[PDB]
Symmetry: C2
Subunit: 129 residues, 2 copies
């Protein structure tokens, strides 16, 4: 199995903070990068930066998973454009249980099963007490 690389693309500091939070739980990550879309960012500039990252990682023979905050919106639109061009895989609605499970099982499952796993865990992790 190819080594995986996780790109987190979200609004503002969400991805940065989500990774920070996960790292409190499971320690400092390699092979995870965050890109945040802030008010005042040009989406085409951000798109080109994301593409830069993907090419670089593909050239390192890595398999790429893009995790997005929200279905719809500029981060999602960027992720979709990368799937159109580079055949990376994409999942939306990322939360903490998903990211922790993803990063601790990244070597265990193939990308398709990995994403199905965390989709299920993410939904199950949302509970009104």
């Amino acid at each position: 199995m190819k080594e995986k690389f996780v790109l987190i693309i979200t609004h503002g500091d969400f991805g940065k903070g989500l990774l920070s939070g996960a790292e409190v739980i499971i320690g400092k990550q390699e092979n995870v990068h965050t890109v945040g879309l802030n008010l005042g960012d040009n989406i085409e500039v951000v798109r080109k930066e994301v593409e830069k990252i993907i090419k670089e990682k593909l050239q390192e023979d890595k398999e790429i998973i893009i995790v997005v905050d929200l279905f719809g919106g500029s981060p999602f639109n960027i992720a979709l454009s990368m799937m159109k061009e580079y055949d990376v895989k994409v999942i939306t609605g990322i939360n903490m249980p998903m990211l922790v499970e993803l990063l601790t099982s990244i070597n265990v499952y193939d990308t398709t099963e990995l994403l199905e796993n965390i989709s299920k865990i993410g939904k199950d992790g949302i509970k009104v007490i």
Copy 2:
């Protein structure tokens, strides 16, 4: 309706960044506070701080919703302990679609319906995107 106050408790800077992120989308919000738990944090101290915030907001006649990152660990432990003593509601597994819906509709629904609403929106907002679905998503940009 009483005004609502949302307290987000998570590991590290997750809650802080989640709120930052949501405000890019829906603009600056009021009545939302974040508490992050880091390694080596004295958690009984954090619990005490949270209780103080809750007491204060209750004195301001606010209805309190606590949102946590994870069903597990210290943030949920703290949230549970508040629920045992105070009239607060708790929801776990917070994500962007949930928080955006929560804050945008905070004065439209009572807490019970509100948490039910955002639970469904949060789960529905978690989607694996199939490559084969790309073209169909693109069509939606040209019709309603």
